[PDB]
Amino acid sequence: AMDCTTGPCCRQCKLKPAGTTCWKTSVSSHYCTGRSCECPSYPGNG
């Protein structure tokens, strides 16, 4: 049982706040939509 939702959008076990850089990968920067714990596959700067 793991309801933490591991991922880049998940600080560790809590859906990061929307409009907050979760990934910010040097090769690809994105943002969390406070909807899931998995950052999208697109940059959030528009």
Curated annotation (Swiss-Prot):
Can you list the disulfide-bonded cysteine pairs? 4-13, 9-32, 10-37, 22-39
Question: Which domain of life does the UniProt lineage start with?
Answer: Eukaryota
- Segments carrying motif Cell attachment site: 24-26
Assembly mode: Monomer.
What's this protein's family per the entry?
Belongs to the disintegrin family. Short disintegrin subfamily.
Instruction: Briefly state the protein's biological role.
Output: Recombinant protein inhibits the adhesion of alpha-1/beta-1-K562 (ITGA1/ITGB1) cells to collagen IV with an IC(50) of 80 nM.
> What is the protein name for this chain?
Disintegrin jerdostatin
Please indicate which part of the intact protein appears here, giving the first and last residue numbers and the full length. 68 to 110 of 110
